[model samples]
Target: GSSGSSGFDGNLKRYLKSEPIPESNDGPVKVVVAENFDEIVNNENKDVLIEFYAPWCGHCKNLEPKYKELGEKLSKDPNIVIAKMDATANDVPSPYEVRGFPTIYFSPANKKLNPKKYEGGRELSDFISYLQREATSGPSSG
Candidate 1:
């Protein structure tokens, strides 16, 4: 009997070709990918603000400047990270799913296992205040 094979590899290649992995750079907002997600977000001992976005998302584009500014403002903080990921080209890990464009999540330093969705205002000040509150709060009890 002959072994059967599907076009899984071909399909994957096509998908990658259609939506290539985004280029990485030393910008304010750190690029998060499947390769570094664990080390960057999960293992890092700091507060992380992550945005799961797509290349062609209008809202994501609009939020870019503000997000970048937010990153720059918090760049001096050694215990904070501002990150963004291209959801179309990467697979998000469990307990974190991207159902829409610009899905934001915050992983506090003390609550790495329990990341919460960010539903606050998109302005720079809004982000700053939110982070300030979270940073000052103690670890979750019970």
Candidate 2:
């Protein structure tokens, strides 16, 4: 008789030590994970599109490609930011709460303006149009 590492235990070990998500440059999105939410997000002078997500969520996984495309297309715009945060990584960053896995919030540049819930489609073009409209309308109106 022989003893060896069980398949289940090996798989469990790998899963437990797996990376949270792909690297920051995994796609064109520059989707930096939030270390200091307020400093990185609120300090900016542009509108922030923050996708609060958990790594294991199915919908959130589905949203990544389109989100990257959105970031690529929007990167040129100096007045908007495309970012993400892992809510389940080290506990969800304070204040920016979420009820869903892939909640998107549109934070306007003006500090006085409140972040608006994005009700639009998840497609890249949809996000582009939404950002365009928001930029044109100005933060106060949001």
Candidate 3:
């Protein structure tokens, strides 16, 4: 048997404030959240390009189109995954810090612990080139 409401009424304000960013639902961009961060980012045996963004940020909005296109272009590759997380609502992990609104990182499958900051241009071609080079490079030659 289950009990009804106790003396403590759940904090509705807290629940309302933590609403997650709306997901693309059916796109190449994998919508990541705090809860699934480890499972999706760490567990996946693929090169991941993650963008930590906030919905309210103007720059984030501007980069959305290019980011999505990048995801689509790279969707053909089984070994690569393009993902993004809502930074404003979710707590970013220690390894992947989010000091700004839109922080991009490339986490290679070979070296997931060490993620590289994406400092290249926002153009689709730039992303394609960078991923091609980095994804193929080995962490350390044997």
Candidate 4:
């Protein structure tokens, strides 16, 4: 088998020069950067749904489109929000540990504490139901 070191280097160079995901956009959901995560989490008027993901992770990449779809589906509701954070390029504070490539959390509206970990399916419908339920439910007992 060939080592092909030069071929690998060429690919890496191009990847490094590529454009990064937009920090904010007019897309289905808001892309949260390091600075705005606190504001969004602490917003008492609206519930925040956050996805902590890595750009190079296959699962994270696959989840992006569906996550956007979920966001668009819930756009009419001002009480809930859908947001994403790039963990690979940002520092994620405690209680929101990066257990895997794509870690999801939900902060119910009116909560001051950290968001709760989300352990659910990764489908469009799954997100919709979770957000709806969370928006309507009160703060967790824990």
Candidate 5:
């Protein structure tokens, strides 16, 4: 089952009022910054899907609802853990050279990320499939 709303149980009103809480289907996704991105990305598993976004970008903001839906879609699998980080604030976009607001990274725990080979812009289903496929392979990028 999904982790559900971050607050108010099944009702999302409380969560929206709270703003920055794990609310969606998984509840507000945990926020990772430069401080913890390394520790998190370093610990890769099929369960970890690192979502990079910036607060100021309208496009990124627009993705909030879709991300929640996607979170619900993928949370069905126990092996996956969804996390979000600020691309600009965390400087994750710098390392990966993310030119846009949202960048989704999928790899096994601690898997080395390859920017050139990155291709995670697809839908949630596509990303889930890719992660599941290469999770056991180790250090995959796409």
Candidate 6:
């Protein structure tokens, strides 16, 4: 698959964080999987947040915890599903145009499939806001 433009810039593209992904006492927020995102992402009737990552990317490592945090938060909504894929392991690059690790795909509220996307920086709050925004409007309404 196609890896992103270049190096995983640190803060500008944070992925791993100081915390570890805590196992839920209840196994809360099961991570979503996509062997082929083309089907999952394009299912517009569902709101899905598919995150692309690479095993080799440090940023992906660092941001994993935070992304998990966001996943846990979004899990209960039912309207959204926070998912992940290793760009290399899953062939995410070529299919999703995922040149970088931590690429996020948003399945619009209206559409069952097909995602509006946003990438870079593994910021937690920023991602939360992004989710809230997309949850409200879609295809980004662009």
Candidate whose lDDT is highest: 3
Q: Candidate 4: global Cα-lDDT?
A: 0.67
| lDDT of candidate 1 over 1-142, digit per residue (tens) | 9888542211111112122335755888887776666656664357787777776988788888878888878877777788877767787765677787778887665454466788878888898777777764422331
RMSD of each: 10.9, 16.6, 11.5, 15.8, 13.0, 12.3
Best by TM-score: 3
Instruction: State the lDDT of candidate 2 residue by residue for 23-52, as single tens digits.
Output: 445555544344445544564366677776
Residue-wise lDDT of candidate 6 within 37-98, one digit each (tens)? Answer: 44444444567777766668887788778777877776556666676655566554222466
- CA shift at 46, candidate 5, in angstroms? 5.5
CA lDDT, every prediction?
Answer: 0.69, 0.60, 0.70, 0.67, 0.53, 0.57
lDDT of 6 at 37: 48
Which pairs clash in the backbone of model 4? none
Put down candidate 5 lDDT per residue, 17-74, tens digits, no spaces.
1122233333645555555554444454444667777678888778776665666665
TM-score of each: 0.74, 0.68, 0.75, 0.74, 0.58, 0.62
User: With candidate 2 superimposed using the best TM-score fit, by how many Å does residue 35's alpha carbon deviate from the native?
Assistant: 2.6
Worst 10 residues of 1 by lDDT: 9-18
Give the residue spans of candidate 5 off by over 4 A: 1-28, 44-47, 93-95, 113-122, 132-134, 137-142
Q: What's model 1's lDDT at 125?
A: 82
Number of colliding residue pairs in each model: 0, 0, 0, 0, 17, 19
lDDT, candidate 5, equals 0.53
Q: 41-121, model 3: which lDDT tens digit per residue?
A: 664366777788778889888889978898877877777788887768777764677687678887766454456888868
